[PDB]
Amino acid sequence: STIEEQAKTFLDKFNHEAEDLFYQSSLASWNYNTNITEENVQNMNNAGDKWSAFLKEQSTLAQMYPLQEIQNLTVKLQLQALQQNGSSVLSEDKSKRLNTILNTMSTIYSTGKVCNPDNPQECLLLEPGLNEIMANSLDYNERLWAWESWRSEVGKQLRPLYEEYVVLKNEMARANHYEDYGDYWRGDYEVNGVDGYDYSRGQLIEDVEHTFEEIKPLYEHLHAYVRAKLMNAYPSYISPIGCLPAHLLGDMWGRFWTNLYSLTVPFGQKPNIDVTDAMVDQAWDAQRIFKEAEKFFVSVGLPNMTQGFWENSMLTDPGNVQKAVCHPTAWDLGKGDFRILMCTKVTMDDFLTAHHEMGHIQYDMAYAAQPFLLRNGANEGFHEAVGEIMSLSAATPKHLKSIGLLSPDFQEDNETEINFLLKQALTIVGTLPFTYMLEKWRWMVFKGEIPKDQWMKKWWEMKREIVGVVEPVPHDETYCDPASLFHVSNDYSFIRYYTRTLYQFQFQEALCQAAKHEGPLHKCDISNSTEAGQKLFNMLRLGKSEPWTLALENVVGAKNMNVRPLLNYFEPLFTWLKDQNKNSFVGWSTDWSPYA
């Protein structure tokens, strides 16, 4: 009779047909990932094409039910998700051009090989170079050569392609009733229709700036300390008053500072909390790693893994004969099927990764009761944040002593906590200005704030102003320096890392307050606490049915992203960094004082 009942029947046929087509696409993708063979590639492509064509036909059929005559929030949310045109609103020629541009950028980034002039007999791919030279070298000109050569080749290839990409994506977004592609990306956090819990696309930029303004003192002190240590490592290149040279940050782009922990360690003489040798001595298999992770999740009250998980997952590298992707990935195949694809080694990193991916699996399992099109995180930040909180809790010395991996007579003094917090800051705090600057630059490019002839002049100006990182030599507009990163070149949103980082510590404070932890936030473990797991599972069960603001109210009691839990987490380190920066100068100058 009514339009709302008609939409409900349509979304009762859709959920059933789509779950089957999804599970076939996901199965084919799994079979390709665990077995790289040409028939598996063909089967994956066929299943993906069937899935995409089916989504196109249902999107075409879903728009005939008008949104304003539906009052039920869940039905309206599913219909809103389905009624998005995506690229379909664009013309077929332009859609084909956009798809071709995306594929060719993927090939250029994936198969970009650069080596030294006059020695071209063998070259280096993206993965060998990053793992070996950008993370381990201590030579200024070698890192400068690798950085400039990779940005020269990749940027000069990708600059016209990116110029076409911005225009096509803006055309599609304005055809989809958005201001620009940046508004399309910011629409993931948009909440409309709920009284009090409404969130606007324009509020996201203001909230990100407001949080970053509070991030800035901690980052400035960390930048000063890293600058002093890098000045010790490289004597003449780094200036006391200027920005850090770009190629010296330990990674290819400056995304993470975690590779500078060796150079910038506060107390080298004190030991680390590495438990790898202890697992090797006790012969811990990957099965034991996942069973310990499962024990951690049952301790907090969450459900344990299914039989189909232990049976169908690949938790060890298969061998030489059978090839598989080595990247750890949690798969929600649908139809109640949850699997982890990880080539697990006996390392601390793999153990923490097992906790992170099983956290992803727990999040996927929790919203299985929800309808098919609402089976996702409330926003893109929550899905990663719920894995990162498990990574935070598992890495604590209390957890390691509890599970027997660390000696019970290990002395936890202030110095080890300071160096551990510095490592966590280099991984977590260091990525925040880079993430914010990159997303703000992309938003300004999509919005038209930056003309095409001024992309790099603004970009370096942004990087000096925000990240405090200076270019080694000036770049003209023939370069395309942002697109050398994986996420930007392959059409991925980048604000998820910033939101994930803030949500991680907000969730950590909420669960630690629930678990009645009485010490520092970084010393908190959420094992053995049923109430903390219940508080988490209340949000976990909702999925995408409820607004992210309401989910955040469910966990932390706040309606907006907050920066105070992060600052509370790093407060011992913040006081220590303030003490260590008395002689040195906090802050940077945007001038060309170190090198240009």
Place this chain on the structure above:
Amino acid sequence: PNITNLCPFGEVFNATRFASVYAWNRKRISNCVADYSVLYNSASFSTFKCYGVSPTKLNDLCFTNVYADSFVIRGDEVRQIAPGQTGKIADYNYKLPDDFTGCVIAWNSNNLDSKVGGNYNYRYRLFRKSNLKPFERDISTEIYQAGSTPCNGVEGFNCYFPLQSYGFQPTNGVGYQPYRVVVLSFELLHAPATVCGPKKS
């Protein structure tokens, strides 16, 4: 005296193929001896929920007729085979009365009723104008009209086909695995009761 002529529970539980939930099979069991302790003491059944009578005294009581309804549903739909419960199965496929005397027996049949390509031989009615009455079977394949517009025998806009298939896969989760359900309905009528339990010597 010497007891023989046991009831054919082998041809219901151990059947090679089961019917779909919509066209659920009903077998009337009469004029034999029904040993219910053989069913209860089996370890192969995941659900043996009895409503209106207890399993211990089933082996003693005697009934006029026994209705064995057999079908295949999903793991998450076993809960809907109960009095009062409301779901797609209860509303549109198989409805049990509130005043039901009998037992609902369900067991996981992932081994038999799944295949690696997907077994699409089990169907469920997903749409009907009204809810089913208890112990009603609807095998009609008429196009469901969700809108004012007449369907005219095509699955066009707002007009859906009622019967949908369950994609049964071995790697599926327990909730989505096929479960064979046998519902035994016990009624006592004024006619001579002939389905009796075995009597001790």
